[PDB]
PDB file of C-alpha atoms and ligand atoms in Angstrom:
ATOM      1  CA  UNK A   1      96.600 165.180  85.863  1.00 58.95           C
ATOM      2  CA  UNK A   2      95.615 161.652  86.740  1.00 59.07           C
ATOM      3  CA  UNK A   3      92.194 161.052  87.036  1.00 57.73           C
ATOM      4  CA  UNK A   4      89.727 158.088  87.853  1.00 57.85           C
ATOM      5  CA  UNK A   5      92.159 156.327  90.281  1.00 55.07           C
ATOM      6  CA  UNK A   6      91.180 154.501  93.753  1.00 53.85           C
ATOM      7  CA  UNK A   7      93.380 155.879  96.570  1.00 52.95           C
ATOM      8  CA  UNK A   8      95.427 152.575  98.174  1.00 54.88           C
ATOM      9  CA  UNK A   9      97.452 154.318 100.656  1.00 52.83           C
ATOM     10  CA  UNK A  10      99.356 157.903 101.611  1.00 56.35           C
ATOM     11  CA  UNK A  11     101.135 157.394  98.033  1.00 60.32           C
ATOM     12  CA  UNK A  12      99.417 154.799  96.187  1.00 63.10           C
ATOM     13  CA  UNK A  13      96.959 154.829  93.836  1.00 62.99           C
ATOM     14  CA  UNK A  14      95.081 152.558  91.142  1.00 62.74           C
ATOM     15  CA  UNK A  15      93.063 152.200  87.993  1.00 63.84           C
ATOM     16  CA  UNK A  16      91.491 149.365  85.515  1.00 63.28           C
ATOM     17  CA  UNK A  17      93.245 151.189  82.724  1.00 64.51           C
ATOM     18  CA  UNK A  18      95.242 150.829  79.513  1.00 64.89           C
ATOM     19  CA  UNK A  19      98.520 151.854  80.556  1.00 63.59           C
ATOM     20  CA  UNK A  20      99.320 152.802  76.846  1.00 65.03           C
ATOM     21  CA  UNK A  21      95.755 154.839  76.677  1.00 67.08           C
ATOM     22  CA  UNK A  22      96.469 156.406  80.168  1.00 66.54           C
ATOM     23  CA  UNK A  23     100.364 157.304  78.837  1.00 67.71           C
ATOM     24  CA  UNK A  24      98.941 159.333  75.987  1.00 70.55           C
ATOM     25  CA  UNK A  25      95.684 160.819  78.044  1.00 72.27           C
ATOM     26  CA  UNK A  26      98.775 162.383  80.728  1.00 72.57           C
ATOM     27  CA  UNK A  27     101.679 162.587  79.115  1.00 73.28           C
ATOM     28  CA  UNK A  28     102.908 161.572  82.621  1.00 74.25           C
ATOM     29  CA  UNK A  29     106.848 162.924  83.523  1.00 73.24           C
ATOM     30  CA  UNK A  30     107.952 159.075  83.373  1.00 68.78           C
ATOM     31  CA  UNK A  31     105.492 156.334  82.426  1.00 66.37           C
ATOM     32  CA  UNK A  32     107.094 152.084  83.743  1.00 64.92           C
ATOM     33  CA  UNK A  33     107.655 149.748  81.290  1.00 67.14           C
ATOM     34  CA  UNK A  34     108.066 146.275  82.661  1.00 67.31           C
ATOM     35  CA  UNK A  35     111.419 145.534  81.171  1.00 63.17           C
ATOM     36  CA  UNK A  36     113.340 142.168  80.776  1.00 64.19           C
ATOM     37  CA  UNK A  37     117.423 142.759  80.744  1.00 63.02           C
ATOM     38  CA  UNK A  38     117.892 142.848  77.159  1.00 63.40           C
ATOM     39  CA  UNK A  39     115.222 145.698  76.592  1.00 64.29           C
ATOM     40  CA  UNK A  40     113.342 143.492  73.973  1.00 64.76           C
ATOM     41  CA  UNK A  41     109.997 144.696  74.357  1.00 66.85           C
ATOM     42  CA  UNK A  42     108.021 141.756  72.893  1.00 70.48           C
ATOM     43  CA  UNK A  43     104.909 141.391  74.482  1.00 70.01           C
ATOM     44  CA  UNK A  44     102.959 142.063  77.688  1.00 70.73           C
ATOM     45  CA  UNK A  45     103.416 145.516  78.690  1.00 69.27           C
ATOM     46  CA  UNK A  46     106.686 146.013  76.936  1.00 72.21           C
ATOM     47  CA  UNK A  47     105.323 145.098  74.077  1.00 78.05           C
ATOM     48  CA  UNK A  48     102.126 147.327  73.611  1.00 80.20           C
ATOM     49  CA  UNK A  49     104.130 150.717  74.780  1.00 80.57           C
ATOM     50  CA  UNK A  50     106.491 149.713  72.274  1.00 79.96           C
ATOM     51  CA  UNK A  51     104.137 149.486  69.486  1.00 81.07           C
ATOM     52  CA  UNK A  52     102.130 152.580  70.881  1.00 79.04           C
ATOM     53  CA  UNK A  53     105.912 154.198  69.593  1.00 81.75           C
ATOM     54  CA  UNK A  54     106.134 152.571  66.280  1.00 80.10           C
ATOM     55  CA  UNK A  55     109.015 150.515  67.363  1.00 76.73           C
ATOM     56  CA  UNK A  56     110.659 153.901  68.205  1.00 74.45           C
ATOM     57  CA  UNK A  57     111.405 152.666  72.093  1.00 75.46           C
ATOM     58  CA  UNK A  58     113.333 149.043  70.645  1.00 73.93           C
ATOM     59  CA  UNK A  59     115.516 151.154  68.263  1.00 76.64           C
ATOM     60  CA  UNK A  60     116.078 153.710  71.318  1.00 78.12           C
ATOM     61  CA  UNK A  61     116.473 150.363  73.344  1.00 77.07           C
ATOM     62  CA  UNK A  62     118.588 148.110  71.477  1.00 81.88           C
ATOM     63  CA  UNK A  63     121.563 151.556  71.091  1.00 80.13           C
ATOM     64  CA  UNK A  64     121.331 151.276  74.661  1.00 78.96           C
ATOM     65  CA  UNK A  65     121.813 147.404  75.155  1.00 78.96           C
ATOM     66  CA  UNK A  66     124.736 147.935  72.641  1.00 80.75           C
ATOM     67  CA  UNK A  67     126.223 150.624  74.324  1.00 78.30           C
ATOM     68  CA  UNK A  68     125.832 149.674  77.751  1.00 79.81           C
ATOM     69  CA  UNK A  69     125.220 145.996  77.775  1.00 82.80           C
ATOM     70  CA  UNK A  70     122.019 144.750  79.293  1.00 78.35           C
ATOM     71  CA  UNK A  71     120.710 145.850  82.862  1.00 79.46           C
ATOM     72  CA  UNK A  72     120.132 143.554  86.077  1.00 81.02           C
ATOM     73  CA  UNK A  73     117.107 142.077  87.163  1.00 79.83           C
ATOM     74  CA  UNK A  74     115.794 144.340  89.655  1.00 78.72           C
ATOM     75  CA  UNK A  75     117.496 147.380  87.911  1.00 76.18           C
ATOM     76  CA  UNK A  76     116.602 149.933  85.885  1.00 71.67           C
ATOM     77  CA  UNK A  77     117.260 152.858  83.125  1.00 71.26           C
ATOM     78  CA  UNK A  78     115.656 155.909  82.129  1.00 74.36           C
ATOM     79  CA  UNK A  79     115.307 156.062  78.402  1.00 73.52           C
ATOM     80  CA  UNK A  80     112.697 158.661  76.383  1.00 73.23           C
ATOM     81  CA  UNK A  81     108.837 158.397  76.819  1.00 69.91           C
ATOM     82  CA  UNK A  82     108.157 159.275  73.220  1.00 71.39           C
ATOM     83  CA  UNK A  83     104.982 159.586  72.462  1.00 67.82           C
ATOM     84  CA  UNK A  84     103.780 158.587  75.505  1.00 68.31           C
ATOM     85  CA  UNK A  85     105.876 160.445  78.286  1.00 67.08           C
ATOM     86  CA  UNK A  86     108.469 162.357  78.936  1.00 65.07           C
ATOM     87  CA  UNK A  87     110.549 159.653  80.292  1.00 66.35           C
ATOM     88  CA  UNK A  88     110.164 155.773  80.329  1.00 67.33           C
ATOM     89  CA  UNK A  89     111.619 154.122  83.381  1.00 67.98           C
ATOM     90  CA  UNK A  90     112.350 150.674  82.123  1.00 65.66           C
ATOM     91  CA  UNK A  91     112.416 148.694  85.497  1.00 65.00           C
ATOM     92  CA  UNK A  92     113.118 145.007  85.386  1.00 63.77           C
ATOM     93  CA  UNK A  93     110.929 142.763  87.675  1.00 64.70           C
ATOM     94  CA  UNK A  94     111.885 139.096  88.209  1.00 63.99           C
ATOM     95  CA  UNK A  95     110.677 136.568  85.500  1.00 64.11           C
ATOM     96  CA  UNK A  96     108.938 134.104  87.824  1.00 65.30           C
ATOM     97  CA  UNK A  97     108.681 131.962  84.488  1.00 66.40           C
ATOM     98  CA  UNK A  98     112.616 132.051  83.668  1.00 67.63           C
ATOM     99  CA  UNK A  99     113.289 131.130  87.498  1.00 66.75           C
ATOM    100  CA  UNK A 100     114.238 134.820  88.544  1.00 66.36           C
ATOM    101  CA  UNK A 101     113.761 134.638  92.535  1.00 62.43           C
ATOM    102  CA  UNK A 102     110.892 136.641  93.338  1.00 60.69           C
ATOM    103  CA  UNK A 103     112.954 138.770  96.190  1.00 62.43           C
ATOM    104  CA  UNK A 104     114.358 141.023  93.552  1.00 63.33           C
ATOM    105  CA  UNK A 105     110.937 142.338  92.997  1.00 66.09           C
ATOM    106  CA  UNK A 106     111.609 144.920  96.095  1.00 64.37           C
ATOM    107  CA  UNK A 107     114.746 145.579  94.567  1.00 64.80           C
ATOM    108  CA  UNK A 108     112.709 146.698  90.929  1.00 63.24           C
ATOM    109  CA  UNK A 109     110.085 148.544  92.737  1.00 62.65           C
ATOM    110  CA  UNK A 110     113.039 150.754  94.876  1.00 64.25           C
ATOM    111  CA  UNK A 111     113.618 152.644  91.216  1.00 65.00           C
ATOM    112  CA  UNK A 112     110.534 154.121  91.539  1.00 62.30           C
ATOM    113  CA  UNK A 113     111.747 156.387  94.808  1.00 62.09           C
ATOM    114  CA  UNK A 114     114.396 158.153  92.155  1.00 60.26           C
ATOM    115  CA  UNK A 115     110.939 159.792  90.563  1.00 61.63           C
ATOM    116  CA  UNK A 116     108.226 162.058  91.975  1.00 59.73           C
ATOM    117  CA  UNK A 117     105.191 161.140  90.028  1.00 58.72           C
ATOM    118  CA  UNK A 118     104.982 157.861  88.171  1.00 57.61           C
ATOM    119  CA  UNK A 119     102.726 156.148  85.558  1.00 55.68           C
ATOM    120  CA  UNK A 120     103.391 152.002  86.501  1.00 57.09           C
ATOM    121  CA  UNK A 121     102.120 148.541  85.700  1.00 58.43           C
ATOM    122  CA  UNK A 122     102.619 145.789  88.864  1.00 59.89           C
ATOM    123  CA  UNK A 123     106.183 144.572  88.272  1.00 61.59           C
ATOM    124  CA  UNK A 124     106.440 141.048  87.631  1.00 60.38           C
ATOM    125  CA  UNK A 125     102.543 140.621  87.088  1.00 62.46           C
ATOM    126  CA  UNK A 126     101.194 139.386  83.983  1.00 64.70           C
ATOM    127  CA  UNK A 127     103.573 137.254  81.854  1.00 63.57           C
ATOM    128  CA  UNK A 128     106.422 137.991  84.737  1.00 60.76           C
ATOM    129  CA  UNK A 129     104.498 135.195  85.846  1.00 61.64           C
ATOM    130  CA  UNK A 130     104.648 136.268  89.666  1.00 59.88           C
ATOM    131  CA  UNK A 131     101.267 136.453  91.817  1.00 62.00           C
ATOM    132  CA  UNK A 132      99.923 140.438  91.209  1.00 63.83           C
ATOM    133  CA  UNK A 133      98.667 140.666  95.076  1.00 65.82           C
ATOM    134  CA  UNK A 134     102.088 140.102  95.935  1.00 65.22           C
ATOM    135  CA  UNK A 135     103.558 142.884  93.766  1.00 64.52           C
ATOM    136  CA  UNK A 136     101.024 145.666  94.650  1.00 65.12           C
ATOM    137  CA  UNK A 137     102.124 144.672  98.199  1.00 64.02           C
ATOM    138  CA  UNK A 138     105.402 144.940  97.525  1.00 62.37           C
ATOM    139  CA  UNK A 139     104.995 148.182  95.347  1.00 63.52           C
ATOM    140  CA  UNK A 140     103.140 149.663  98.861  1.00 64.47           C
ATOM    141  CA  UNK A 141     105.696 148.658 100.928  1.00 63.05           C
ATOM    142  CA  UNK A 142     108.095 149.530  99.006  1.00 63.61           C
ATOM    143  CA  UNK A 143     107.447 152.507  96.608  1.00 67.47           C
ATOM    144  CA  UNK A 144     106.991 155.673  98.701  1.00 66.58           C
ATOM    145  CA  UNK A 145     107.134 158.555  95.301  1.00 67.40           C
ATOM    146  CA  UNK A 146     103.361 158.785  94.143  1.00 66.27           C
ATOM    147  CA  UNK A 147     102.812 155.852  91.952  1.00 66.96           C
ATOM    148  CA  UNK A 148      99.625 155.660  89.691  1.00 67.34           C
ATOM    149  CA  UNK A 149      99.401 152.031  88.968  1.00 65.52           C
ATOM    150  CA  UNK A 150      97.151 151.175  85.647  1.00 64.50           C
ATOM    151  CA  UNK A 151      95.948 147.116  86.021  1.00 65.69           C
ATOM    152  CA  UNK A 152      94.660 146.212  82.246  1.00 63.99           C
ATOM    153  CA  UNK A 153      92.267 143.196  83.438  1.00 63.15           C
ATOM    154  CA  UNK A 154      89.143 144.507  85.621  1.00 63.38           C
ATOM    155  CA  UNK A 155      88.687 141.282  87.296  1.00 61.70           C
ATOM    156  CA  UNK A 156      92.597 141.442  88.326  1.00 61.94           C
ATOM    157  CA  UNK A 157      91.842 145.204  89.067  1.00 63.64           C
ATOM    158  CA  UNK A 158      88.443 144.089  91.344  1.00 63.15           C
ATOM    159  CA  UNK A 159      90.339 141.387  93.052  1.00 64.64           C
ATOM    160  CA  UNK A 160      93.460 143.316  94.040  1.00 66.49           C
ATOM    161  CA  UNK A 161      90.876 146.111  95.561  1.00 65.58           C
ATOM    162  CA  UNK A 162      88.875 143.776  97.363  1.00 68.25           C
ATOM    163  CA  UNK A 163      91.911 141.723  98.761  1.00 68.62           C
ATOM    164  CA  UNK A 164      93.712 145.031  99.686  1.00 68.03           C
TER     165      UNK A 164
HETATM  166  C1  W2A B 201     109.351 160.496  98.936  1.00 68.32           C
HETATM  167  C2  W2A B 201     110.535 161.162  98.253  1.00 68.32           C
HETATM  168  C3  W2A B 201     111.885 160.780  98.899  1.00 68.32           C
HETATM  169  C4  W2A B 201     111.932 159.328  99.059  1.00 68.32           C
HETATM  170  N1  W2A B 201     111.978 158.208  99.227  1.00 68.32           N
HETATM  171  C5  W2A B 201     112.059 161.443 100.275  1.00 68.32           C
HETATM  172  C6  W2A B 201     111.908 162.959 100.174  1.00 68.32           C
HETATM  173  C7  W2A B 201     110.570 163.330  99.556  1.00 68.32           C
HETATM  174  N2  W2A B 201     110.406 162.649  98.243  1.00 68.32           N
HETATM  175  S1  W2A B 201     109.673 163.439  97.023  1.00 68.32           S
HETATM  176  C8  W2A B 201     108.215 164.163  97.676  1.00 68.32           C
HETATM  177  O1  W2A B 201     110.555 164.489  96.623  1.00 68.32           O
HETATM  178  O2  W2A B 201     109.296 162.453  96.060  1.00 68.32           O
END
């Protein structure tokens, strides 16, 4: 199962980690992506678990946006994991950088209760543009499924410990 991770709280845990590497190390049940609305996983997260499918999860994505149209900011879908998990839970955090008001972030995080176990970055963090001390707060007020947070940057990873 999961190994290496700092226990936060009753349901919480966390990791300076790869979240691609740690997806193929578990295989976890559902692994986040940190989705925008139209499922175009360019960069950031998105991005690298996208390429870790071989483009697999935009193909898989962009039947979806046609089908369905694209999803809400703070919503979610649960597509394939590929090679990475059995499921990906694409969850759409606010864009802090497109405007997005940074109360929908509770909203996103709520998705994770519909799943046991996750594998998850910090919704909204990184090129979401929103401050990552307020998101793990968020996710531990919020999330209460076990959640297995991977934070790529060890400085990030050191100060969200230390400010805990
Ligand atoms: C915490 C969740 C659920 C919520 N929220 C309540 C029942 C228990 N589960 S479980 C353990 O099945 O994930």
């Amino acid at each position: 199962s999961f190994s290496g991770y700092l226990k936060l709280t009753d349901n919480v845990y966390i990791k300076n980690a790869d979240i691609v590497e740690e997806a193929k190390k578990v295989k976890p049940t559902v692994v986040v992506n940190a989705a925008n609305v139209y499922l175009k996983h360019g960069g950031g997260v998105a991005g690298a678990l996208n390429k870790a499918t071989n483009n697999a999860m935009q193909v898989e994505s962009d039947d979806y946006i046609a089908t369905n149209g694209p999803l809400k900011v703070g919503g979610s879908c649960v597509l394939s994991g590929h090679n990475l998990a059995k499921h990906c839970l694409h969850v759409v955090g606010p864009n802090v950088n497109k405007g997005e008001d940074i109360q929908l972030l509770k909203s996103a995080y709520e998705n994770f209760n519909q799943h046991e176990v996750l594998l998850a970055p910090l919704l909204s963090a990184g090129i979401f543009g929103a401050d990552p001390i307020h998101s793990l707060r968020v996710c531990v007020d919020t999330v209460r499924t076990n959640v297995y947070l991977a934070v790529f940057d060890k400085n990030l990873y050191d100060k969200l410990v230390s400010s805990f």
